[PDB]
Structure formats: structure tokens, C-alpha cells
Amino acid sequence: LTPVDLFDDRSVRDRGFDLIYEARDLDLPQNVREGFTQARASLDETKKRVKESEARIDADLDVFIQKSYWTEAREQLRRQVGTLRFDLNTLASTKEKEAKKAALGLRKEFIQAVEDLDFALREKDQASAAKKLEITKAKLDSVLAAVL
């Protein structure tokens, strides 16, 4: 008969462990539970992920297109990019009211470029998806030169 064994896991909560426990207690608001309050309260964490989102777009999405990996390019545009709509509203809701319409107007057309890139990646049209991506990166730089 042997005792149980311990493991030094006191730093997993520092990294990522207590994150699914915040999303399961029904005493917090859902904006605290879904991660929406924490994104609005800290501007730099959105400014980290938005610069990370263009690192997944400007460099990581064309590579799946010349090799025609469609289901790895459909979901490249949804995995870490899957917060970018919520992020580009928080970075645009820190501006002047005539600067916010300039921000949300540029943000609206970048949405229309990604949703057109998604449909290009949906019918597997490589000649269109390689063309819709260069439009998408140009509308991406227009938003990020406005909200940050």
C-alpha cells in the first residue's frame, strides 16, 4: 500500500487553468463569464490579440491557399480570428464620435472583405481566394491604422 503522489501544478492557474471555472459559476454576469468584460476592461489585451489576428491573416492564411488547404483556411479565419469582430468594436469604442464612424465604417468594410474571402474559400476558387485575400489585408490595415 502506497500513498498518493503530488505534482507541482501551482502555475497552471497562472497560465490557463482557472478559465473554465469562471465560465461555469452562475453568480458572475455572462459578460464576465464569456470573457467580454475582461476584453473591454483591459485595452492592451485586445491590442495584443488584434496584432495577433493580423499575424494569423497577413502571414498564416495565404500559405493554406497556394497549397489549397481549404478546411484549414476556413477555420484559420475562425479560430483565433473568432474574437476579432468583438475586438474591433472595443478598440473603436474608445474614439471621438466622428472618429468612431470613421472607425466603424472601415471596420464594416473589412467584415465585407472577410465574408467575401470566406465565400471564396467555400467554393474552393483559388484564383478568387488569392485575390480576395489581398483585398482583405488592405481593409485590415485600414482598420488597424484607425483604431490603433
Place this chain on the structure above:
Amino acid sequence: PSYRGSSFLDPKGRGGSTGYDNAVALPARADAEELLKENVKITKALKGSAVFSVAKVDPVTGEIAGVFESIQPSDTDLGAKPPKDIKVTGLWYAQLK
């Protein structure tokens, strides 16, 4: 490894880590000559041998494939039947990057 885990339970509810360790529905012959299949549920892992043979190299993409041949034990029913030898052949594939 053992085909069932240690917390696997047989139809009479006994097993290695969880379980009764005896035949509880037969209370007079609960522990008896049948200790081979109630008293220890053996979860000892065995060993198998495999032979790989690289058949094709695509070095410009770093991709190699071939044919494999393995022989391994089957299953011991947590230590209740003798395990049998199974020869598995077929193909394989990898990416050298």
C-alpha cells in the same frame, strides 16, 4: 498495455482498482477456487515487436512511407484467458520536417 483499464468492471461488478474482488451473488462460495478471475484482475502490460521498412522517400517535401509488420498479444481479460498472438501487416506514412 492491458486491453481494459484497472477501473474496468466485469459483469459481476468486480475489477482491479474499483470493484468487489469476489463473487458477491454467491455468498457461500464468495472466495473459492475461482480466485483466477475474481481475486486479482491482472493489468500487467505485455510487449510486442514491430518491423518497419521504409519504401519510398520524397525528400523535396520530407515525406517517407513504407510497409510495417508487427506481432503483439491480444487480450488477457484482466488475467482470465491466455493472450493470443496477432500478426498485423500493412502500410505506414510520415512527414520528415
Place this chain on the structure above:
Amino acid sequence: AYGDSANVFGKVTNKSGFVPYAGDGFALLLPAKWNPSKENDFPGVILRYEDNFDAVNNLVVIAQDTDKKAIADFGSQDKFLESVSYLLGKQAYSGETQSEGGFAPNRVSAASLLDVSTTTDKKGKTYYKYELLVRSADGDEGGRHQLIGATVGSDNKLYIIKIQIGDKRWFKGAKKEAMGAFDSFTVV
């Protein structure tokens, strides 16, 4: 049969979800839906309440007499838990296994320390508070959360609280009952 009026249209007396308790030398706020268990798991148990719903959710206090006056005299917090490692139980299965998944060989249970602290109270005595998640090979309750806290009182006696909550009940609201009981533990 003493005649006291029924509480028609009356104010409640306890919506806190906690009952204040006073044993011998300690005081804590028990989870109000828990009831006393007549079990002595360990040498030194004073009280041991368990949940009415399942007996995995429980707490226990342990008062060992000791020769030392401060909790720092037991060494550091890492060297303290290895001495009091009997709180997590013993693996009664000394069988050999490599087919359980997410464990070392021959281990069907693996405790994982997740948090330590060194908090104190208004008297000055520091505590050694712990937070573990003990997983098993069958993985009942999705694991078991352990809330160990220990101190030595003013009578050279080691008071150890251990709140055990199954992980299935942990995200479903037994964290509020356990942490509220765990923070309320004060040894006078």
C-alpha cells in the same frame, strides 16, 4: 407543547447559506445544508460534516497535539504537505498497471497541488492554506477538490481543516459553500 405562533408573513432568519460553528479552540461557518457524519477517517477528528446529497462533499477538522508553537516550525509549505499527505488517502491498490490514461505507471490516483497561500487573521497566527485537485483512474466526480488549511493554536495543538468537494459539484455551486467555509476557519 409550548405555544409559539407560526411564522405567517414573517421575515426569514437565515438566507446566508452558512451556520456559525464553535467547537473547541476553533470557529468556522459550516455549509448550512450539511449534516454531521458519524465517521472518524483520521486520528484527531473533532467534527466531520458531510453533504446531505452525496458523501463525497464533506469537511473535517483534525486537532493533533504537537511540540511546536508556530506553523513555520513545521518547515515550509512544500515540506509541510508531504508530512500531512495522509489527508488525501492511500492508494489501496498495489497492482501493476499502464492502461489508465493520464497517470504515471502503477498510479491509479494523482493529486495535483494547484494553490498555496500564507494568510493570517486578526490574532497574528499564519495559516497554510492549500487547494488540490485529486484525480483518479475511474475519474469519479470529474476529480475531487481538496481545501486543506492548517495551523497550531494557543495550546500547542495542530488544527487542520480539510474540505473535500467533488469536481462535478464544484462548478455547480459547491465552490461557494466550500470557500465560504474555508475562509471562515479561525482558530482562537
Place this chain on the structure above:
Amino acid sequence: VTLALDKDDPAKEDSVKGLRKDIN
């Protein structure tokens, strides 16, 4: 060491020794 009453309490507890005179 053990009375015959508190040997039949931890073994059966339905015992006719343990049930009668149990007002103490």
C-alpha cells in the same frame, strides 16, 4: 474491555439487548 451490549451494537444494532432500556 467490551460489554455484551456494545458488542451487539456494532455487529447487529437491531439486537433485543440494544433496543430495550435504550432511554439512557
Place this chain on the structure above:
Amino acid sequence: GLPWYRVHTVVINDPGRLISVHLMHTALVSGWAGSMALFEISVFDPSDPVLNPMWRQGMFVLPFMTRLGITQSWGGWTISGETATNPGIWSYEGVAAAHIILSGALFLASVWHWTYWDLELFRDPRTGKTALDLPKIFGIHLFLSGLLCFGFGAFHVTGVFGPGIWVSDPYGLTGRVQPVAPSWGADGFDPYNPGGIASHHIAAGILGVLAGLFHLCVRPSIRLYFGLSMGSIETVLSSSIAAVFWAAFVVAGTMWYGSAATPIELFGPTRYQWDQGFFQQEIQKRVQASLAEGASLSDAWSRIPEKLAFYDYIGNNPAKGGLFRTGAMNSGDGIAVGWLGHASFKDQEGRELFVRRMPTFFETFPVLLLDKDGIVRADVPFRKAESKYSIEQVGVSVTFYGGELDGLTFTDPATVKKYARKAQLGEIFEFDRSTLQSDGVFRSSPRGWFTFGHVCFALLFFFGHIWHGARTIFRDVFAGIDDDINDQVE
């Protein structure tokens, strides 16, 4: 013609064929009694009356012969465990033959009354039709009943002329057939007093004679003639079926609860003796009688009879059985051979431990080892992944005292778990699953089988009372109701 369920009602009109058809049933009942007693003698094993008695072997009607004095056999053996030097004519085989000889005599009498059905006795005078004087016929048979009742009570039970009944001690150890004295105080209604049985049949026998003399002479009332439908042979059937399920609830009730008319050396212990710790308390009463006078453990547990430790066992409990677990109690767990000792449990802190016994409800029951004060200290856990009451860590050793394993200690955590799971079943015994090829799961005693039949019969005879009481009160409307019966509404 008649349906299949109505064929026996050809006998309701003629009393001569009613004699002949009760004689054939009486020939079959005593023909069963001798044939079952021949079957039970041919399979009874009289070798060990201490640890393989008659209720352990599935003997059903042999404890009824032994209850009223028949203790000896034409094979030499007895029940108390000695050789019969003169078996006499009233052996078990003499009585098994006396019922078969009576079965053929009642058979021939039934053939006589079937052919000679048209006797002049059955036709009443001056009407000439077949009639029975059921108030006086009852007065005859109640007079004979109280005459046999007083005869059985004053002579057979009391030992004035007959042998007597079975009387034992409270603990089923020293039991014989000896005469009893009648007890006429309040003590005669304690049903564990055998003296109240003799005092019953004298007092109920005398009153049954005096009541019989009433019903011989005093004709009934006319208002109570019609209201109980006395002129029908079926209003006596309904009231008799009412009499025999009342009796069968009392008879199966006293068999199940135990009485002086149901000894435990004949029928086995009751389920309320395992539940209430009846033999366990006495086994502890005799150990503490020896540890207080000054003695060792192993010298005190040797002084307990091996028969007393066998009553303290869950396999001899009549409520640990099954409806289709058929046969002897020896077919379940084996023939008991020897008492294997008294398992005493100690842990590594030198503290005694006591196995929580299996309650009578539980088919399976977890083994728990409690201390003196009643707190669980060790168990055989179901989850062994992180245990805190395992026998391996607590360090439970088991020592025996008396029996076949006297002075022997087991510290092996596999061996201790085997005897901890036998100690919840009671005292520890050694069986043999090879002599009868035993299944491994317990059976019920004849005390449980008798009770099962005689409540299922007492409940089905409630319906037969309901049917035959309804056919007398509603005799005129049995074939249907009248055409103008619409006057019963407003």
C-alpha cells in the same frame, strides 16, 4: 352440459356420493402423508443431529412426526443422537406405513359409498327426498371434535397415557419429547409455553363437548335458519372455508414468529432471532460468564456448543432464501462439517473490531469493521484508488478462538478479507460443496416454506370463502336475474 369448473357439483344433491368423494380426498391426503414420510426417511441423513439436523436437510413432514413424540426409526437411529433399542411400532416407517394402509382402507370405503349412494339414512322421513340435518350433523361432529381435543390434550400431550410433545430450552440446545403439565394461569396464553398447549386442548376440548351437546339438542332459530341459509350444504362450505383460512393464518403466523408448537430444533430458527440478536447475545453471555470467572479467550470460546454457534448464522435464517431456490438448506451453502472458530479482529493500534452483520434484507452487503463504540474503522472498499479505511492500511489481523482454527492468526490482507466476508454471515463454518454439489446461495428452511404455502393457501381460501358465501346468499339468481326486476329504481 357442465363446464370444466363445475363438474364436482354433481355431488351437491346426494349425500352418499358426498361421503364417497370426501373419502377419496382423505385417502389422497393420508396417502400423501405416508408417501412423503417414506420419501423423507429415504433421503434423511441422521448422522449429525448437531450440525446437520432435519430442518437443514429439507425435511418437511418429519418435524411434524417428531413434534408429537415419534423420535425413533427402524434403522436404529433416533433424533436426539442415539441408537433406538426398541423402535416399537410407531417409528417413522411405522407411521409412514400406517398412513398408506389407511389410504387403501379409505379408498375401498369410497368405492363402497359411490356404488351404495342411495342409502335410506340420507332420505328424511315423511318427505322421502335426500336431506341432511346440518344443525345436528354439526352437533355430532363438534362433539367428536371436542372429544378428540380433550383426548389429545389430557392424554397425549400431558403424558398421562400418550408420549408428549417436543419441549426444548430457550436456545435450542437441549430438546426432547417429554410430558408437560397444563398451566391454567395467565402463563398458559404465552405461546412459548408448552403447558398452554395442554391447557388449551383440555379447556377447549371440554367446551367443545359442551357446545356439541348444545347443537345436538337445541334446534336453531327460524330467523337464523334463513339468514344463514342453513338448509344448504354450501353455507356450511363457505363457513368452513372461512374457518380454515383463519386457521391457516394463525398456523402460518405461529410458524413464522415461532411458538412452543414450533420448536427450533425441528423447524429451524426464526428470522426474528437473527434480527434481534437472539443467539449472538447468549454466545456473548457465555463468553462473559467465563471471562469474569477467570479464563482465557480460547478456553472460553471452546466451552460454547457447536450447535449454538450454528443457530447464529445467516444461512439458517428462513428469510434468506428464494422462491425458486429449491430444495434443502444443505443444497445452498453445503453440509456443515465443523465450526471453524470465532473470528476476532484487531488493527495495528491494538483495538478490537466487530464486523457489521448482514441484515436479512440484503442479498449483498458491504463488509464493515466497527470498533467498540460503533464507529467504522476498516472496510473492504469498492474504490481502492484513494482509500482511508482499507484493511491493508488499518492493519486488520484476525484470530480465531475455539473451533477448527483455534489459536491461529491470519494477517494476510487477502485472507483477512475472506474471513471478514464470512463473519458478516454469522459464525464461521466449514462446508462441503462436493457432497451435494451445492449452488452457493442460500435456501429457506421448512419454517419458511410452510409459511409460504399456508399464507398462499389462506389467501386463496379467502376468495373461496367469498365465492361460496356468494353462491348461498345468491343461490336463487345463480343462473341469471328475473325479467321484471326493474322495480329497484325510483
Place this chain on the structure above:
Amino acid sequence: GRDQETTGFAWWSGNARLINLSGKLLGAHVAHAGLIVFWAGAMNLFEVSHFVPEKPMYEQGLILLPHIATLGYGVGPGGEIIDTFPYFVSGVLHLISSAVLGFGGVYHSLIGPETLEESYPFFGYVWKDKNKMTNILGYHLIMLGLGAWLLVWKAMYFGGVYDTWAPGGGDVRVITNPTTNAAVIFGYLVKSPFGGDGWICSVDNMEDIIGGHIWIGTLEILGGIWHIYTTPWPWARRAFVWSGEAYLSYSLGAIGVMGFIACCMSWFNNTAYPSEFYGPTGPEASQSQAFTFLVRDQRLGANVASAQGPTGLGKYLMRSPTGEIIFGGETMRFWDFRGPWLEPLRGPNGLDLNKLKNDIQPWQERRAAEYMTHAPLGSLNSVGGVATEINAVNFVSPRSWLACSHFCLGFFFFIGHLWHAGRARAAAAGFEKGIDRFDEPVLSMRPLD
């Protein structure tokens, strides 16, 4: 009003008195259509008044607000509710229109003509007139067809609808390219209903939904014009009963299937019934649990690929019966689940564990942990766990209310089909009152049947 002996119908079947009373039957329907709009107004404003923004929409017992949220009124990215006033306008415009429908329903039931045959010949109808019945059938298909174009115009032109599969998370998306391919649109209809197909309950994107409503909009405008300018052909005279109770029974069997379809639609689909608004599906919450303990135990130092379960199949990742790397456990039955939080982790060959050991996103484990504690099991008094659970939370999923109500309504309207189709076929045959007792047709048959 009307009584029994002038009709032959008791009080408990007295709406059957106005079968051949065209105007009273019109006021019966318009007043009933007032009630559907009144409930939709009243229960909308009840749900707007009891909406709490610091709680999910599916936690609050809201079944009508997720329908307006799926259209994209007042929702933000990720299912966040921006404002509640678009849900308030939908409640009032039904609650005010219910008085208008309630007025003419009360009008034609009390004051308006009993039969509008001789005075208003355009609206008059006899049930056996097969031209006029198809004429009214054609008028309402054009109303259903133009109603189906309202969903297409609102998705293509009027702000868009909520796409839960949108890149960047779910928000409102203008559906610029609806799928008008007949092989795709009519491929759902001929698909099997079983596992991996789900007939039309697996429609996985909004482009098939909006493009399918183009098809159902044009075919009902064309099929309405077809029935206005035609009468039923002689083979259709041969097959149908042409009474008013028959036409009811035809509608009852059609609508009882539709209750069964919307039962399995709201239970399984998460595209037209987005999980941000309706909560997780049955498959979604069970797959969310295996995903939650896979991320819980990677961080506690365990190879979830090489982790063997107690049965030997794989505790976290196993293989589908067609060969896809799926989640292990009893949730192997829901391996054909697709979700917008899960599909970013899924490659061709099932789930991609290289993508799943390194690229689990923090928003995915936010959302999948939400779905595990909001599984569609509850109780009838809205407790919210398995049947072995204490009174802690207050939750039954809307999917659990929408499926259970519409199986029961779908079951009774199949019973209403069997009632009225049996009766109308027998009442047209003449023997719905009973056997004639003079010519009983069994008595003219050969015995030993």
C-alpha cells in the same frame, strides 16, 4: 348562437355547427388568428420585461426573443444583446394588430353574415366546389410565398440575419450569396433522416437557409398561380374526400409532421437555432463536456491522445466508426455534431490533435464550459440537472421546451388527423352516425370471413 337539435351537435362539438356557415367560420378564424398574434405580442413583452442583460438569453426561459435575435435585431458579435427596443417593437406591433384581428373576428362571429355566399360571391365557398377551394389555396400560397420572401429580403437587404458560423465569431451577416443550386437545395429533402444526414435538420449554414427560402418562395407564388388557374385533375377527384372536415384533416396531418420536424429542428440544429440564443443542443452540451475535460487535463500534464480509458477505447480522443478522430466517452454517439466553437479545431481527418494540443483558443473554452453547465436536461419544475440533482439552479433549456411542446402538439395533431380523416371519409360515405340496422353490410357477406 345556435343549439343542438337544430344542428345535431352538442355543446362540446359546437364549432362543428359552423362548418357550412361561411361567415361565422371566417370570424372563428380571424378571432383565432387574433389570439396567435395576441400571444405573440403578450409573450414577447413578457419576455422583454423579464429580460435581464447580465444573464444569457437561454437561461431566462426566453423562447420568442431568440427568434427575433436570430433575425439579428439588437444583437452584437458573439450573441451579446445590444439593445432590447427592437424586441419591444415586435411585441407592440403584434399586440396592437391583435385588436384589429380581434375586432373583425368578433365582427364576423356576431354581426357579419352567417353565410357569405349570396351577398359576397367572391368570398363565398362551398366545400365541394373544387375550383373555389383551390382558388383559396392559391391565394394563401402567394401569402406564404411572399412571406418567405420577407426572410430573404431581410437577410439579403434589410440588415442581414445572425450567422453563427461567421468568420470572426457569430454576428449579423448580410447573406449576399444565397444558395440557389437545386442539387443542394433539393438534396436536403431527399436526404435520409438518420444519423449523419438529419433530413433537413442539418442545414449547416445560413446561405442554404436563405437560398432555400428563395425556392420555397418562388414555388409557392408559382404554385399559388397554378391553383388559381386550375381545378384538381380527375385522378385527384378519385383520391380525395371533398368535404370541409376532409380539408381540415389534410391540414392536420401536414401540420402534425411539421410539429415533429420543428421538434427535431430545435433539438439538433444550431444554425437556424443559434446556440448563443437557444443554448447548446443535446449533442452540443455532451461534446462540450469531453472538450472541457480534455483542456482541463492537458494543463494538468496528460497526453490526451495516448490516454487510454478504462474500456480501452480512449478517454479523450477515439476513432469514429467511419474513421474520424472524435471525442471519447459516451459522447461517441454525438460524433457527427458540428459546432462553430468546435469546427475551428477540426481538420479533414476528424479533429486535428496537433491543432488541439497547441491552438485551443481561450474563447472556445469559455463557450464550451458555458454549454456544459447549460445542458438541455432539467426538470418539470425547472431545476436543471440530471434527475439526481439538488435544487441549486433554475434552468430548463429553451430547446428542451421547444422540442417537448412541439412533439406533444405534433403528436396530438396527428391524432387530430386520424380523427377527422376517419370521420370525413366516413361522413362522406354516409355511415358516420352508425350502422343503418336495415342493410347492415356484414349481414350481406359470406361467413367464415
